[PDB]
Amino acid sequence: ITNLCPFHEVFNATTFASVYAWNRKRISNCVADYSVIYNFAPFFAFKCYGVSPTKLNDLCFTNVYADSFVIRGNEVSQIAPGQTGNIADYNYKLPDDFTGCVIAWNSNKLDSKPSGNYNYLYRLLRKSKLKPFERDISTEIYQAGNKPCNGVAGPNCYSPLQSYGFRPTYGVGHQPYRVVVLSFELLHAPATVCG
Amino acid sequence: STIEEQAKTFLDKFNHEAEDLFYQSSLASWNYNTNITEENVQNMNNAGDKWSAFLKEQSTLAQMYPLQEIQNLTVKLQLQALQQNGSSVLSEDKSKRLNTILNTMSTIYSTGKVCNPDNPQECLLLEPGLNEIMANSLDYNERLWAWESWRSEVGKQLRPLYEEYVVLKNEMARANHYEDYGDYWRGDYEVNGVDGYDYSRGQLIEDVEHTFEEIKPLYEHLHAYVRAKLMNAYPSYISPIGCLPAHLLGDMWGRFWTNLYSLTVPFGQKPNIDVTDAMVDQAWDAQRIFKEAEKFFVSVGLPNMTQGFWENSMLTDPGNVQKAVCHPTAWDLGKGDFRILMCTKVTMDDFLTAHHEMGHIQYDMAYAAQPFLLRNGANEGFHEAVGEIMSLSAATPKHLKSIGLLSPDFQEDNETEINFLLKQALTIVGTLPFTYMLEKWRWMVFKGEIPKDQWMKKWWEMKREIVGVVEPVPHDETYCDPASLFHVSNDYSFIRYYTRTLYQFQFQEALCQAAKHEGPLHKCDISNSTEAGQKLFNMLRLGKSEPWTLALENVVGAKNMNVRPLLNYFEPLFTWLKDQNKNSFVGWSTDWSPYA
Ligand SMILES: *[C@@H]1O[C@H](CO)[C@@H](O[C@@H]2O[C@H](CO)[C@@H](O[C@@H]3O[C@H](CO)[C@@H](O)[C@H](O)[C@@H]3O)[C@H](O)[C@H]2NC(C)=O)[C@H](O)[C@H]1NC(C)=O
Numbered sequence: 001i002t003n004l005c006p007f008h009e010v011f012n013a014t015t016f017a018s019v020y021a022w023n024r025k026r027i028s029n030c031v032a033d034y035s036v037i038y039n040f041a042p043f044f045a046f047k048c049y050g051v052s053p054t055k056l057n058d059l060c061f062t063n064v065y066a067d068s069f070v071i072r073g074n075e076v077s078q079i080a081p082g083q084t085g086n087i088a089d090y091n092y093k094l095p096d097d098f099t100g101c102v103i104a105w106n107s108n109k110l111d112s113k114p115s116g117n118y119n120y121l122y123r124l125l126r127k128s129k130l131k132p133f134e135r136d137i138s139t140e141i142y143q144a145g146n147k148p149c150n151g152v153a154g155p156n157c158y159s160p161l162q163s164y165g166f167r168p169t170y171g172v173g174h175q176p177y178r179v180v181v182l183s184f185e186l187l188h189a190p191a192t193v194c195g
Numbered sequence: 196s197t198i199e200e201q202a203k204t205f206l207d208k209f210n211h212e213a214e215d216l217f218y219q220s221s222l223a224s225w226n227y228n229t230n231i232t233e234e235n236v237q238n239m240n241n242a243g244d245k246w247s248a249f250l251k252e253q254s255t256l257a258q259m260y261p262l263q264e265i266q267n268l269t270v271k272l273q274l275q276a277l278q279q280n281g282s283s284v285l286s287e288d289k290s291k292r293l294n295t296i297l298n299t300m301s302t303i304y305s306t307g308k309v310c311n312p313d314n315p316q317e318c319l320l321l322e323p324g325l326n327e328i329m330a331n332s333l334d335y336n337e338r339l340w341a342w343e344s345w346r347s348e349v350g351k352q353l354r355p356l357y358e359e360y361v362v363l364k365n366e367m368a369r370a371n372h373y374e375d376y377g378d379y380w381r382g383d384y385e386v387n388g389v390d391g392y393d394y395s396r397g398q399l400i401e402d403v404e405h406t407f408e409e410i411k412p413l414y415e416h417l418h419a420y421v422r423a424k425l426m427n428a429y430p431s432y433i434s435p436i437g438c439l440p441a442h443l444l445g446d447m448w449g450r451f452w453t454n455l456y457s458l459t460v461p462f463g464q465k466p467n468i469d470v471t472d473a474m475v476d477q478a479w480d481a482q483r484i485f486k487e488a489e490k491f492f493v494s495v496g497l498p499n500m501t502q503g504f505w506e507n508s509m510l511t512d513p514g515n516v517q518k519a520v521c522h523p524t525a526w527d528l529g530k531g532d533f534r535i536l537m538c539t540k541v542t543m544d545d546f547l548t549a550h551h552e553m554g555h556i557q558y559d560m561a562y563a564a565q566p567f568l569l570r571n572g573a574n575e576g577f578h579e580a581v582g583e584i585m586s587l588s589a590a591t592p593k594h595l596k597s598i599g600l601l602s603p604d605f606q607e608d609n610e611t612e613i614n615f616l617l618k619q620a621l622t623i624v625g626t627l628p629f630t631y632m633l634e635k636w637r638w639m640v641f642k643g644e645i646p647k648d649q650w651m652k653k654w655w656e657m658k659r660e661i662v663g664v665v666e667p668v669p670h671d672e673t674y675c676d677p678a679s680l681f682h683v684s685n686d687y688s689f690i691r692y693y694t695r696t697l698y699q700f701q702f703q704e705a706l707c708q709a710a711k712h713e714g715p716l717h718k719c720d721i722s723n724s725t726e727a728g729q730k731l732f733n734m735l736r737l738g739k740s741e742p743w744t745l746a747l748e749n750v751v752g753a754k755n756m757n758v759r760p761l762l763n764y765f766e767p768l769f770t771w772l773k774d775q776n777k778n779s780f781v782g783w784s785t786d787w788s789p790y791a
Pocket residue numbers: 083084085203266267268269270
């Protein structure tokens with residue numbers, strides 16, 4: 001076979017950044033084989049909206065986008081079409097007509113430390129809801145109050161970013177879950193991606 | 196924007212930080228309790244100080260928002276909880292001396308030692324030896340000596356300390372909006388803003404008084420029976436018309452009459468139901484004891500335990516090198532972690548206690564979704580009430596036979612039911628007059644109705660009138676009789692036990708109607724009824740979000756506590772007591788006393 005898609009790069013990256021700054025990786029000009037995806041760890045949630053699970057290999061697309069991030073157990077449901085929640089509206093929004101499969105698996109072994117995995121962050125304060133497929137990384141002190149914050153923290157002035165803490169003893173639903181969202185798009189060009 | 200949205204964002208930030216900090220503190224405390232060592236103590240102290248500082252800072256911050264502008268019937272309660280001023284409003288010297296008084300009272304209660312009369316060989320602490328002597332020894336003189344010596348040992352020492360304590364706590368309450376410290380304690384039962392479900396702080400006084408007025412006949416008949424039995428046991432000391440002497444009640448303070456089951460047993464021939472030998476023959480261990488307890492909650496429709504719970508929880512005594520505390524406790528550490536710290540052995544009491552603790556954890560799991568501040572029971576009583584209903588249902592002979600510990604051959608007679616009901620009566624009904632009396636005395640002292648020069652006189656007069664207990668050796672104002680009790684010494688509210696005692700039987704009546712039981716309430720098992728489980732889960736999920744009045748309405752169909760379920764529970768014993776008390780005087784006379 002000429003080419004195989006870098007599925008072992010989007011998965012097994014050993015660091016998925018955070019949901020507020022999600023990795024946007026472009027997959028193109030390769031043969032997409034989902035056999036290795038199935039051969040990876042058992043998936044807590046493997047739901048396909050636009051592309052049928054059976055026809056994943058059959059259908060061909062011009063470009064493939066995979067978004068990798070780490071979210072809590074209960075936040076997995078918010079990553080879906082038509083679902084509203086803190087993560088969905090302020091971190092990452094799947095479009096209304098999203099086509100692809102949401103792939104999630106448990107990462108308590110790697111992403112949890114007894115000291116605490118404060119590195120991962122999420123956003124819980126923002127002025128307006130995010131449009132689909134948008135990235136925001138700039139930290140402006142949230143001005144919920146009537147007075148300008150002047151770029152410092154204090155009364156009615158909170159930093160939008162907040163940290164997940166991941167520990168081995170956490171229960172399922174708060175354990176860190178690794179989610180890589182496969183986005184398939186058709187463009188006015190040769191597909192060059194066939195399974 | 197509006198302050199309501201500002202308060203909402205503040206609450207979100209506070210919740211998300213407080214969850215992590217509380218988890219750190221809870222994990223430190225769990226580590227200390229499971230494995231006692233200097234490093235663990237240091238970590239727990241650090242975590243506790245950090246959490247206390249964070250709570251103080253957030254409480255100071257939250258005072259910006261006036262509660263008048265908050266409408267959401269949830270943000271208002273969270274902001275009220277934060278604005279309760281855990282930050283000591285008192286002056287620095289006043290706070291330091293209040294902490295000193297609390298520490299001194301705790302130290303005196305814990306290190307109070309009683310020495311033998313004119314014998315310096317041993318000076319006994321209260322808990323290890325003196326309590327056992329009071330519980331099991333049948334010597335009138337020894338019991339009287341133990342009681343009087345403990346009173347003179349602790350109450351005389353703590354009387355000026357208790358006076359300074361009441362003065363300082365009254366000053367703290369006056370600084371706050373509450374009328375007195377009794378009002379501060381009753382504020383937990385208060386409900387404001389929800390018309391048609393509201394409650395008043397003073398309304399608790401009327402409800403408790405009316406409930407005791409309803410209870411009084413049963414307590415009088417049980418008192419007559421116990422008086423007759425204790426007269427048979429001790430011939431000269433007990434009078435027929437007089438009240439019972441204090442030291443013969445069964446414990447140091449008379450709180451519990453469980454020690455009197457041997458002396459007041461209805462039928463000696465009939466053996467009590469106990470499954471220790473059966474469990475040993477079937478070769479059980481603590482893990483499967485807890486599994487059998489879990490199957491009950493699975494049957495009632497509630498969820499089952501977490502794999503993390505099974506992995507982290509220590510249900511078996513480590514023994515040997517490991518050092519740990521063996522007081523049972525159910526821990527909701529936070530963020531989905533639930534554990535039990537229990538040195539469980541193969542005994543029926545341990546099995547029932549395991550049921551009680553897993554009831555605690557089911558409550559904690561149910562209210563997990565709600566915000567951190569509201570992640571508690573609706574009032575102080577519901578949490579142990581939910582534990583106790585499961586404990587009661589677990590011990591039923593129907594449940595025992597369904598599990599298979601009890602043989603199919605056995606059937607229960609009148610005598611077994613009477614014995615079981617009378618044992619649970621001495622456990623449950625007896626403590627209600629004592630709790631009522633202690634809370635009435637303490638509330639009156641806080642309000643100032645009882646003068647300092649008449650503290651103990653009014654205390655013993657009200658005990659003689661209400662609890663029907665007479666002091667063996669007369670005590671002047673130097674003694675401080677209430678100071679001996681643990682809750683009085685360490686400043687714990689005591690009306691929680693009365694409320695729990697009523698609530699558990701209201702819950703049991705409601706869930707037995709849900710399970711469609713026919714017959715006496717005592718032989719009621721809610722195991723396989725999924726209606727009762729759902730009816731309970733309705734309240735369990737609410738937490739503190741809805742008022743406790745609404746939670747109680749949801750479960751039992753009433754907005755107020757009623758003792759009718761308790762009287763329906765003990766009706767068979769009430770009839771048996773009528774029958775046995777035909778030749779015994781009912782009621783007690785105050786005038787008689789052991790002295791003069
Ligand atoms: C007081 O404010 C709180 C918010 O701080 C209100 O909470 C309610 O919370 C639930 C969370 O489950 C919200 O429900 C959600 O609705 C979306 C939209 O349909 C749905 O996608 C989610 O799955 C979820 O069901 C609910 O909207 C929210 N209510 C309001 C009015 O925002 C609480 O109700 C407020 N209490 C009042 C009315 O005073």
